Amino acid sequence: VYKSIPKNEKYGFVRSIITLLSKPYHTRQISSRTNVINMLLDSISKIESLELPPHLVKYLAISYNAWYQSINILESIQSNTSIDNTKIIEANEDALLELYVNLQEEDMFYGLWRRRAKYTETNIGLSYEQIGLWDKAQQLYEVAQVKARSGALPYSQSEYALWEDNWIQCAEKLQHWDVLTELAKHEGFTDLLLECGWRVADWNSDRDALEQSVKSVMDVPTPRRQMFKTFLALQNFAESRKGDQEVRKLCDEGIQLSLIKWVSLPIRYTPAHKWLL
Amino acid sequence: KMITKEAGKRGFIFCSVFQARLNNIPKIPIVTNPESLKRVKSNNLKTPLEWSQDIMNGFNVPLASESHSLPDTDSFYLRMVGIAREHGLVGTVDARCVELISLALDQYLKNIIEFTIDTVRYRRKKYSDYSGLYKSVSEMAADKRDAKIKQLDDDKNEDECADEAKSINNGNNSSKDDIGDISMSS
Amino acid sequence: PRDVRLLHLLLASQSIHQYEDQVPLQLMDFAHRYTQGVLKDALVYNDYALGVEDIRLAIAARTQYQFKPTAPKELMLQLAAERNKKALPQVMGTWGVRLPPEKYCLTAKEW
Amino acid sequence: RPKRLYNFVEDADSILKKYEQYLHSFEFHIYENNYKICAPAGLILTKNNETLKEFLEYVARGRIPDAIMEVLRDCNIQFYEGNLILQVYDHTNTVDVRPRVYRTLLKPNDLTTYYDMMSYADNARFSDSIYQQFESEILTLTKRNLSLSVPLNPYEHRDMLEETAFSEPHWDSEKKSFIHENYEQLMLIMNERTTTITNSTFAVSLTKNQFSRLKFIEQWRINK
Amino acid sequence: RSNRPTITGGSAMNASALNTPATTKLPPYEMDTQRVMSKRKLRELVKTVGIDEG
Structure with missing residues (x-):
């Protein structure tokens, strides 16, 4: 029945489709596996004419499940003659790479990145990073960063x-925490929280300096920052006996947060479920 | 009393070059006073590294001579926060005084335009209880700039409206800011 | 009055030895109105927040539109530089005085 | 009575011809669609903006902009008799073997002297009459080349002159006469970049209540 | 809102399931305000001052 919509009227129809999909009342179907958003994106994917929506909407229609209903849409623009801009294609690739990161499918991430990259040192660094050689990848990312300042x-x-970011990830794998500690002191960032192990034997002389860093960022909470808050409560029970036994409450709210994050992912096991385990 | 007065009563300045210098320079608020330091640290207001960036971002607004349109809310906000950081106010600018500034500009320009409009014409249907279309020129907004001279800010703007708004007929006004050179004829 | 002869000494202090009679009267009736307006606006600005910074606000409110502006040389230099960009036009070479065009002269007009 | 015969230049072309075979003061570059204003030896590279579109109106009129004076004093560049030499490189019309080199001169104004005095007023704290005396002495020492010589006045030697070299009014019949004269913006609605999770957290929290990293890594490797 | 396309999604670590909020919704956006936007405002100001009015 989309064929009844004639030409010179597809723009208003696709704009009304974006208006329907961007409605705020769809959060009453977030906790469901069979949302109207899935049932509607699946019918968008069977058209190939309007099958380009704004495509950072498809990457943000991941508040619902719609993972492969969005990957179908975003990959049917890679293989479409939609070359009206070179800034629609790169934003399509950005949304597709971010969906691959959210599903932890790293081989498709590295393949799409070194299919779309322009520098050559980016390609060499991404290849060494996929293999697992992070020293040479770190050096190649430094070389690619230098040639862009004076190129x-x-x-x-x-x-x-x-x-x-991939320099920071290679430096995290190589366990250079003394560099990254002052890099996170140079700019406001919870890389500073991710030195929970920082050649440390106390975690108590700077307890307040970590509690303020946790409490300033423990709104819009993630399972990792909730784990940090639970560890701070556990250390409070440890260093001061007859503590709180709010650790038995923070672990339970962390388990419930991780269960919401588990239901937000696909049903079948993705590599992203390994971190929840 | 008057066998006692002298020079050296003040702490002022009077060198007009130095007054123009201090009116020209951009100044950022700093802190040395400890009570005001704890007063500005409590209300989560930042160090001068943010107020200097706010000076620069309030200066970098495309001010309304360049855009040829009345400014909007974000331009008003950025210019007023830059000005408030210039004067010393390290707090936050309210969101209703921007709309107050908007209505102030509205009634100011409406007064100026109305008392330019009712001088090129005598509206007979108005101003009463029982010809065509005119465009106001810059010579008219200089001519009723002086017949009703109270309506202005008396700042730079009226000085340039008196000094440079009137152009002689070889002025070459419809230009591109550079074609009035002598070498563009040869 | 004390201020008539104080204005006599003020005028004589700046080498003004000939003047009329109602000139210190005019100076006193200026100073009365100026101080009354300044103190009324300062009472408003003190009910808002007397003191000296209050007087400074009340005399900076009205410096901006009546008296002689301060250090106007750099704005006038900028304005002169905007006017002195244009090179001078071509002049007549018949050694006399040339008028503007006839519509820009006060002759083709009617009552 | 003068002691020697002096040769002082107060033009543009003569000062430029005197100051060829000398190192320049600025170094301006015209690349494709972007420009660069560097020093003769982190120097910035600009997009087509409006500060440059007003600086270019001060090089087709060969005068220094009044804003730059103090910072030129800060940046240790070479002046040349009050003027500075802008060397422009047009890279669009280069030749193969080097871009097209222009060498123009910019001249001081009254505004440049006033802004130099206003920036002298920062750390000197002089009065007004010292600036008057300083300006008078510099206007003496730097403004030579005066055309003070009077020709004949044509209005007194009227009897030895052609008759129609003057223009007086004449009386005509009953009057007298003087002499006169869409889609791309739809497909990118949510394309707003986010630097980090903390910044996203702060941006969603406050609504309800450059290569600095590489430079930091380099300076931390230098400090060790 | 997270438009970073790099590995770890602009986060300290690359888990990407532990560094993502639990329940989210769509960010605020706006359509093309071209029709409702006027290039010239002073012509509207003189329009509301100077009308025909017979």
């Missing part, structure tokens, strides 16, 4: 973040 290429504002 003739515009680096697209999406490879730059890749160089920064």
Whole structure:
């Protein structure tokens, strides 16, 4: 019945489709496996004419489940003659790579990145990072960062973040925590919280300096920051006996947070479920 | 009393070059006083590294001579927070005084435009209880700039409206800011 | 009055030895109105928040539109530089005085 | 009575011709669609903005902008008799073997002297008459080349002159006469970049209540 | 809102399931305000001052 919509009227129809999908009352179907958003995105994916919606909406229609209903849409623009812009294609690739990161499918992430990258040192660093050689990948990301400060290429504002964050990930794997501690002191960031192990034997002389860092960021909570709050309560029970036994409450709210995060993922086991385990 | 007065009663300045310098320079608020330091640290207001960026972002607004349109809420907000950081106010600018500034500009320009409009014409149907279309020129907004001179800020703006708004007929006004050179004829 | 002869000494202090009679009367009736307006606006500004910074606010409120502005040389230099960009036009070479065009002269007008 | 014969230049072309075979003061570059204003030897590279579109109106009129004076004093560049030499490189019309080199001169105004005095007023704390005397002495020592020489006045030697070299009014018949004269913006609605999780947390929390990283890593490797 | 496309999604670690909020919704956005946006406002101000009015 989409065929009844004629030409010179598809723009208003697709705009009304975005207006319908972007409604705020769909949160009364977030805790469901059979949302109207799945039933509607699946019918969007069988059209190939309007099957390009704004496509950072598809990546944000992940508050619902809709993972593969969105990956179908975002991969049917990679193989479409939709070349009206070079900034629609790179934003499509951004949303697809972020869905691959949220599903922890890293091989597709590295394949799509070094299919879309413009520098060559980015390709070499991503290949060494996929294999697991993080020293050479870290050196190649430094080389790619240097050649963009004094070069003739515009680096697209999406490879730059890749160089920064993947340098931080390689330095985390190589356990250079003394560099990253002052890097997280140089700018406001919970990389500072992720030195829970920082060549440390006390965790008590700077207890307040960690409690303020947790409490400033323990709104819009994640399972990791909730784990940090529970460990602070556990250390409070440890160093001061006859403590709280709120650790028995913080562990339970962390288990409930992790269960909400488990139901938000696909039913079948993805690599992202391993961190929840 | 008057066998006692002298020079050296004040702590002022009077060098007009130095007054123009201090009116020209951009100044950022700093802290040395400890009570005001604990007063500004409690209300989560930041260090001067944010107020200097706020000076720069309040200056970098496309001010309304360049855009040829009346400004909007974000431009008003950024310019007023830059000005409030210039004067010393390290707090937050309220969101209703921007709309108050908007209505102030409204009634100011409406007064100026109305007392320019009712001078090129005598509206017979108005101003009474029982010809065509005119465009106001810059010579008219200089001519009723002086017949009713009270309506202005008396700042730079009226000085430039008196000094540079009237153009002689070889002025080359419809230009691109550079074609009035002598070498563009040769 | 004390201020008539104080104005006599003030005028003589700036080498003004010839003046009329109602000139210190005019100076006193200026100073009365100026101080009354300044103190009324300062009473408003003190009910808002007397003191000296209150007087400073009340005399900075009305400096902005009546008396002689302060250090106007750099704004006038900027304005002169905007006017002195344009090179001078071509002049007549017939050694006399040339008028503007006839519509820009006070002759083709009617009552 | 003067002691020697002096040769002082107060033009643009003569000062430029005198100051060829000398190192320049600025170094401006015209690349494709972007520009760069560097020093002769972190130097910024600009997009097509409006500060540059007003600086370019001060190089087709060969004068220094009044804003720059103090910072030129800060940046230790070479002045040349009050002027500074802008060397422009047009890289769009380069030749193969080097871009197209122009070498223009910018001239001081009254505004440049006033802004130099206003920036002198920061750490000197002089009065007004010292600035008057300083300006008078510099206007003496730097403004030579005066055209003070009077020709004949044509209005007194009227009897030895052609008759129609003047223009007086004449009386005509009964009057007298003087002499006169869409889709791309729809497909990117949610495309707003986020630097980090903490910044996203702060951006969603306050609503209800550059290569600095590489430079930091380099300076921390230097400090060790 | 998270538009970073790098591994770890602009987070300290690469778990990506532990560094993501539990229940989210769509961010605020706006359509093309071209029709409701006027290039010139001073013409509207003189329009509300100077009308025909016969």
